[PDB]
Amino acid sequence: NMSLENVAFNVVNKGHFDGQQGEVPVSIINNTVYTKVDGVDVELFENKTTLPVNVAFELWAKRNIKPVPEVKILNNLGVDIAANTVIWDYKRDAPAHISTIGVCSMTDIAKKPTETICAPLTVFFDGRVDGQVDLFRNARNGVLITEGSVKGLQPSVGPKQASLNGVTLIGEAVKTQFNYYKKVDGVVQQLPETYFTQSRNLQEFKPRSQMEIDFLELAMDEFIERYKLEGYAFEHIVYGDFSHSQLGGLHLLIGLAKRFKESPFELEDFIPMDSTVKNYFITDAQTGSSKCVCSVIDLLLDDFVEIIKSQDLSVVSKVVKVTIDYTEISFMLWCKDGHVETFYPKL
Amino acid sequence: NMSLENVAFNVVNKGHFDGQQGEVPVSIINNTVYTKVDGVDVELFENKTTLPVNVAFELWAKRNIKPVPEVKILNNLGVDIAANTVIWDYKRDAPAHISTIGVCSMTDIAKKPTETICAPLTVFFDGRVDGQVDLFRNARNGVLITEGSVKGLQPSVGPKQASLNGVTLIGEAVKTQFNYYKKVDGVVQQLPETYFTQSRNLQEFKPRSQMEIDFLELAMDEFIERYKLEGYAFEHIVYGDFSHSQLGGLHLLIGLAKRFKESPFELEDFIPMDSTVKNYFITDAQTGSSKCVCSVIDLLLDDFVEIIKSQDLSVVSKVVKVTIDYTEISFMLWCKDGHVETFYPKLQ
Amino acid sequence: NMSLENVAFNVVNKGHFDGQQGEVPVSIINNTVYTKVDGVDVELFENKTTLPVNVAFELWAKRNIKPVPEVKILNNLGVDIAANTVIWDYKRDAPAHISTIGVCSMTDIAKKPTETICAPLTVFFDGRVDGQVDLFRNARNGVLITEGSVKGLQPSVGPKQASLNGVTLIGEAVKTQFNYYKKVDGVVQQLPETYFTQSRNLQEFKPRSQMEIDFLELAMDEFIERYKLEGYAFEHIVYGDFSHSQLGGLHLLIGLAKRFKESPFELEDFIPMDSTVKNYFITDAQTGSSKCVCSVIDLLLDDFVEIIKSQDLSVVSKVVKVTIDYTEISFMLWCKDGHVETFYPKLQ
Amino acid sequence: NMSLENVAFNVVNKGHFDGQQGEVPVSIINNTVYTKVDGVDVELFENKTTLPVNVAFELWAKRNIKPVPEVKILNNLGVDIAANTVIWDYKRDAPAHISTIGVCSMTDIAKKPTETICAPLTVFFDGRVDGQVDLFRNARNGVLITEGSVKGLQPSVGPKQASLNGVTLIGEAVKTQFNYYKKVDGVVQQLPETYFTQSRNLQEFKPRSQMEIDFLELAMDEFIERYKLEGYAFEHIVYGDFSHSQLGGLHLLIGLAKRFKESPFELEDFIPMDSTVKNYFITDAQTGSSKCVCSVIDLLLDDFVEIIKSQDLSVVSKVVKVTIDYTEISFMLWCKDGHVETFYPKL
Amino acid sequence: NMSLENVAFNVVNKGHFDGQQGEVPVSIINNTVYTKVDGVDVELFENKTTLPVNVAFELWAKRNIKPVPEVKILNNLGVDIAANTVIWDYKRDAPAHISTIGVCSMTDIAKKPTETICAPLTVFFDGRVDGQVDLFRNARNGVLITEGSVKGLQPSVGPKQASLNGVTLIGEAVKTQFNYYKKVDGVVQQLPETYFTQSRNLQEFKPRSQMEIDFLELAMDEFIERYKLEGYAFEHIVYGDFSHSQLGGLHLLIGLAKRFKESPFELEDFIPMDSTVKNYFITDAQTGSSKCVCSVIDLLLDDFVEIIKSQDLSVVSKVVKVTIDYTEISFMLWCKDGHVETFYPKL
C-alpha cells in the first residue's frame, strides 16, 4: 500500500521513509508538499529537482541515511544508478541518479538489478546490505563498496570520509572508509592508485597534518623556507596574488581558507554540484582583485607538495595528469627559467 | 487505504472513485495529474479549482454520478454542504461546496452529518441513499430530496430536470424529478410556490409547449396576434431589437435561440457559474448591435406570458418579484401609457 | 548551430524544423514559448507534456510530418524509440517516446541507432528514409515500415490508414499503407494474422462497406433480418440499450455514430491516449441512461460480424482472444441458452 | 476603499497595514507581489502560504505588531481564530489561523466575533483592545489575554515571554506576560498548573538560573555531584551519548546548546512549526552518531530536574504526564535496577 | 549565432557571457535554468526578476563585471538605460534597467545609443570603453563616468567606492573612483556639491575616521564631551533610545552597528532596493522596543556632525535639505528650547 500519504506519514512520524503503515492528509501546491497539522498546512518538502514534486518527495524520503560515498566519487567511477536505494545529492538538492531500481514506481527501470535492462548500466551496490555482493558478481557493470574483504576480489581502499545525511565526515561512531570494486562489461577492473580530495569547506577548515598547521601558522616566507619550496611559486599558486586587477593563483582550498580568515571575499559557485575540481568566480572585497574562473582543489597540502615537486620544470607549458578521486585530473604547469610560474587544475 | 495513487487507479479502471483496491504510478506537475501507461505519461485531471491539485482530483473522482439537483437550485435553497457525497459544479469545473462530510481528509469537517459542527450548516441529504431521510429528520438544518413520499412531510415538487455527469436532462431511463423538503432550526419549512427555469442551451434548444413551437415556427407578427400579446412589447423583450447600437431587449432564452438559428452572435459569459438569471455581454455579428449586460432567463414561454400578463402596468418603472427556482427574482418593469416598454430580470 | 532561437526561427519561417539558419527573439513564460513580432509577443507553443517547455518545443518542431503509423500500432508492436525522427503523439499532445536518437541533445540517448545503447530497445525504422532498411537489417530489435518489397523479407500488410500531422487518413495523394517487419533478438519475426481498427471518429463517420451503409440507412429490424443476425444480440451490442439507468451494450463505434446522428450524448475520454480499445464514461442526453466504463472499438462492421459469428456460444461467460492491430485483445462473451447476451472488448 | 494597491501603499509608506489612504502600482507574478519604484519592480512579499498570493499579502500586512502569545501556546489552548487581528506564524511564514473575523474580505467568516458562525470556534480575544473583554464574556468558546485583572475572573499567569514581529522575547520596554482565561461551551474553564518552555534557540542560548550556568560551566561529573543527580542518567538524557551509531539521549535544548558550542551538528527540522516538543533528525559532524527522531524540549534545567527527581524508578517502562505550555506532554521513562536509563518527551 | 544554449555554454566555461562559441543542453522549468552535466541537471540560474526566465538569464550572464557605480547613484542621477552593457542590481537580483541597447534581442530598444529612440532617455556611458565618451557628447540625455579628465568637460568627483560583482568596495587593485558628467536636453549640467553615503553594512562595519573609532570605543558621555555635541541630542539620534515601547532615534548606520555588536535586533528591509536612505521595521530583541519605519543613513560620522552643527535650532519644526549621493535628501529637525530633540532623514 505505497502512496503519497503513506510517504508523508513516514516523514512526519519517523523522519524519513521507514516502511511503516499509516497516512496523513497532504496538499500539493507551488512545487511544495504540505501536510495538515491541527487545522493548518505545514511544509514537508520543497522540490528543487527537475522531477515532479510528488516523485521527488518520495525519492527524498527514501534516501540512504547511512554513510555513503560522496557523489563526486560515484560520478568519477561512472555510476549510473543505485541498487534498491536512493543516493541523495545534497549539493544539488536532488537525486544523484535519474532512475531507480526497486524504489519508486514512477522512476524504477527495474525492481531488481539482475533484470536485463540494468546490464548496460553501472549499478552501485552496497555490501553492507544482505545480498548485494552476490548481485555485484552477477552484474555486467557495477561499483561495489564494502566494509571488509570479499573473497578473491582485489580491493581499492577508498577515501577516509563519507557523506551522512549531507554531512561529510570521517566516522568515529560509524565506519566511513570502504573498499571499492568496479566491473566493466563483465570484467573486474583494477582501480588506479589515486590521491583523494579532503572535502573540507572554507570556514570550518581544519588542518590535517603538521605541514598544514605550519602553513596556517607561519608566515609565507617562513613556511617556504622550512619545506624547501623555493622556485615552485608556492605563494602565487596556493596563497594567491591580489595586487593586480586579475587575481593570480589561489588554487588550493587551504590557501583560500587562510585568506578568508584574514579578509573576506565572495565565491560564486556558478556550477553548483559536487566535483573533484571546483570552479569559482572570485572577488576579493579588500582589494577588488577578481577572477571569473578560479579553479580550486582541496588536496592535503603534503599531497600537493609531493605532486609539484615531482614535476620537470624545463618546459614553458605542459599538461600534467594526476589521478585524484579515481579520475584523471589535468593540471596546467607553466614554467620559466627552471622555476614554476603557475600550476592549476582544470575542470 | 486512502491514497492519491489509489484514487488514480479507480479513475483509470472504473471511470471514477469506486472504492476498489489498487494503485497506479502518478506524477503531479503543471496543476495536472498524470499517470504512467506503458512508459509514458497520460493526463488524468487538469485542476481548474482554487484547491490544491491533488485534493481537487480526489473530490472530482468522488463526485456524485447519479442525477442530482442543478447547482442553482441548491444555492437558491441555501445548501452549504452535502452529506457524504460531492456535488461537482460543471459550470465552474469545481466542487459546488467548499467543505465535505465523510469524503476527503483534506476537506472534511466531519465524518457524519450528525456531528455538531454540521448543526448550523444547511446539509443536503439524498433520500435515494439508505439512512439519509432519517438523518434529515434528525438534522437541525437541511434540504432533502426524495423520489417519492415521506411519511408525515408535505413535499414540494421540484423541476423536471436534473444534472447527470454535467448533462442537464429530463430522465426517461432514470428519475430526475425530486420532491424537496427543507428544515431551518429544526422546523420543517413550507417551500413557496415557484416557477422553474428550463436549463436549455442555445444550440440544442427544444420547445416544450405548443406556444414555444408556434414561437419558433411563426413570424413575429402572427405569433403576437395569435396569443393576443399586443401592448406587452414582446418584439422588444423576447425577439430583441437590433436596429440601434445598443441592443434592445432579448431577455428570454427562446428568443436568443430563435435569433441564433437565423444569424449567429457572440455571448460572453463573464460570470461563469450556474444561476437562475444569467448576464451576457452580447455582440450581434450581422448588425453590430451590442449590450454589455444582457440579462437572460430560460422560462417556459407560457410561464413568462403568465407572469407579464399578471402585472399592473400603470407606473413608469417598478420592481416585480417572481419566485423562480425557489428564490425571489427581481424584474424591472418599464411602462408607458398603460403598455409595456420593457421587462427584464436582474442578477442579484 | 542547435539553439532555442533557431528552432523558433524555423517554426516561424517554415512551419516546423527544417534545418534552416536564422534566429528570432524568444520568451519563455507560463510553460509557453513566445516570439516577438513587431514589438509584441506571439505564442508559438504551449507545452502540454511532462518534459521541460523548451525541450518539448524542440521535439514538437522536429516531428515527423510525413504519414506515419498511428501510435497504437507502434505501441502494440512494442516500439520503444524512433531512429532519427520524432513520432508526435497528437492524442496526448506529447512525444510518443521518452528518448530520441539523433534528434535533440537533451533527450538523445544516441546519435545513431547502431550505438550499443540501442541494441536492446525496439527501434522504429522508416524505409522511406535512405539507409534505414539496412539499419534494420543490422539492428538487434526493430520495427521497419516500407512502401514496397524488401529483398529476402516476407511482409505483413499493415492498415490502410496512417497519421499525417495528426490527421488519420487513407492517402490518395500520398501512400499510407505500409509493409511491416519486426526483429526480436536479431531474428526476423512472423507477424500474426490480424484485424485492424478503422480509426474513424463519431462526427465524421464514413462507412467503408456495403454492410456499414445498410446499417446506417436501414432500421435495426431490417438490418438484422438481412444479414441473418438473430441470436447475436446486435440490438444490445452494436445499437445499445438506453431503456434502463445503466446503458446496455454499445461497443462498436459505428453504433455510437448512428446514435449520435439521431440524439447527442456525452463521451468522457478519461484515459486520453491512442489505443486499440477505448473506454468512455457515456451519458445519453435524451434518456439519462449512462455507463461509467463503456468499452468501444472501431472495427469494420463486416469484421465484427465475422468475429462474433466465429465463436462457440455454449457457456455462460468466457474470454475470447482476437488479434487486432497486431495485439491480442481480450473480449468477454456472455451467452444464455445458446445465444449471445453481450460481447465487449477489454482495455488492458 | 480597501484594495490590493492600498495594502501595498501602506506596506511601502508605514511598514505594515496602518489604515492610511493611498495607492501604489502593483504587479503579481511568481506567487510574489511587486511594486514599481522609479521604473523598476521591487519585491514586497513572497507567498509561502497555501492561500492565494494577494490574500496572503493582505493578511501579512495586517499582522498583529504588538507582543502576542507564541503560536504553540495558542495551539495548546485550542485557539481556532482571532478576533479582528491576524496572528502571523513566523515559523511557518503563514497565518496561524485559516479564517479571520473582520480582517479580510476573502478570509472573513464574520465581521464581528458575536455573529453566530463564531460560537462553535475558540476565538482569541486581546484585552488590550477596547471592547474585547466584553466580547470574550459574550462568546461561547474563547481564549482571552489581558495585562491586568478582569473583575470576577480567575486568571492563569502565562509565560514570561511573547512574540513581537517574530522575535520571542521577555519584554522590558513592553509587557509580554499576560493573564490567560479560557471558556468552553459558555463556561469559564480552570486552566491547569503548568510548566512553560523557554523558547530559546541553539546558538544564542543564554542560561536563566544558577543551575543552568553551572551546567554550561562545570564538567558533567562535577555538575552531577553538586546537584545530587546520580542514578538519573542525566548525562545520557541531557548531554547525549555520541559513542554509538545511534545517538543516545540528548532531549533538553541546553544540552544541545552545550554540545553545539563544542562541536557542530546538523538538525533537520522535518516538521517546521512551533510546538512545545520538537522532533529533529540529528547528525553529529565529529563522530557520525545520528538519530532520525530526536525529541527535544527547552525546559529551564531546574524545572526538568524537579520533574525527573519526582519520578518513581521501580518500573522498567512507564508513561509520565507533565503539564507544559498548558498541554499534557507524555514522557517515556525507562528504568533498570532502580536507576533511570532514559527519559524523553513525545510529540 | 546568439542563443540560449550559447549563453549557457559561456556561463559554464567562462563564468559569465564572454562571446565564446559553443553550446550546452539546457532545460527550463520552475522559472529556473538547468544544464545537463553527466546525465543530471544542474541549476545555472534562478529567475527572481519580473522578466521571462530565459531573458533574465541572458541579461545576468551579460552583466558588467568591472567596478560600476552603485545603483543608488545611477538612480539619483536619473539614469534610465545603459549603453551596450547590463548594470545588474544585486540588491534586487535583477537588471537595474528595464530595457537595453545592443545587449539582448528581447530587451533592446536600439543597437546603438545614437538611434533616435534613445534621445529622450538618460543613457549611462562608460568612458573606460572605447568610443563611449564620443557617444556621450552626441547623446541628448546621459550620464558619463571616466577614470580621467575629458577635454573641456568640468568633472564631479564621485564616491570612493563602487560595486564589483555585487561587492561594494574601495578599489586597491582596480580603480573605483570616477569622474561624473551629466547632460540634460543636450546641455551639460553642473552636478551639485554633495556628501556621499559610505555603503557599509551592519555586521562588517569598519570605521573610517578617528571620530568613528572614538564613537565605537568611548562611552557616549565621553564621546559627546570630546566632540562638543551637547544640545544636539546625539545619543537619541545616533545611538537610539530603547526605554519605551516605540524605539526613539537611531538614524545613523554606525549607531545601529554599535547597538548590534552589544545586543542583536531584527531589521525588516520591507522595500529591498538600493537607496541613499533606507527604511527598516526594527525590533530590539533585548527590550522589545520597536519602530515600524526607522529611517537610516550611512554617513561618515564627521559628515553628519558637520551637518547637524550647521543647523539653526530656534524653530520647533523645520525641513532641512542636504545634497547626498547627488540627490536632495530632506531631513526633519525637531527642536525645543534651543536644543535638538530629533533629526532624521526621509525616504
Ligand SMILES: N=C1CCCN1Cc1[nH]c(=O)[nH]c(=O)c1Cl
Ligand atoms: N588566469 C587565467 C586567465 C584565463 C586563463 N587563466 C588560467 C586558469 N586559471 C584557473 O584558475 N582555471 C583555469 O581553468 C584557467 Cl585556464
Ligand SMILES: N=C1CCCN1Cc1[nH]c(=O)[nH]c(=O)c1Cl
Ligand atoms: N439596457 C440597459 C442599459 C443600462 C440599463 N439597461 C437595462 C438592463 N438590461 C438588462 O438586460 N439587464 C440589466 O441589468 C439592465 Cl439594468
Ligand SMILES: N=C1CCCN1Cc1[nH]c(=O)[nH]c(=O)c1Cl
Ligand atoms: N456494464 C457493465 C457493468 C460492470 C461490468 N460491465 C461490463 C463491461 N462493459 C464494458 O463496456 N466494458 C467493461 O470493461 C465491462 Cl466489465
Ligand SMILES: N=C1CCCN1Cc1[nH]c(=O)[nH]c(=O)c1Cl
Ligand atoms: N531512540 C529511539 C529509537 C526508536 C525509539 N527511540 C526513542 C525515542 N527517542 C526520541 O528522542 N523520541 C522518540 O519519540 C522516541 Cl520513541
Ligand SMILES: N=C1CCCN1Cc1[nH]c(=O)[nH]c(=O)c1Cl
Ligand atoms: N518616530 C516616528 C513615529 C511616526 C513619525 N516618526 C518619525 C520618523 N522616524 C523615522 O525614522 N522615519 C520617518 O520617516 C519618520 Cl516620520
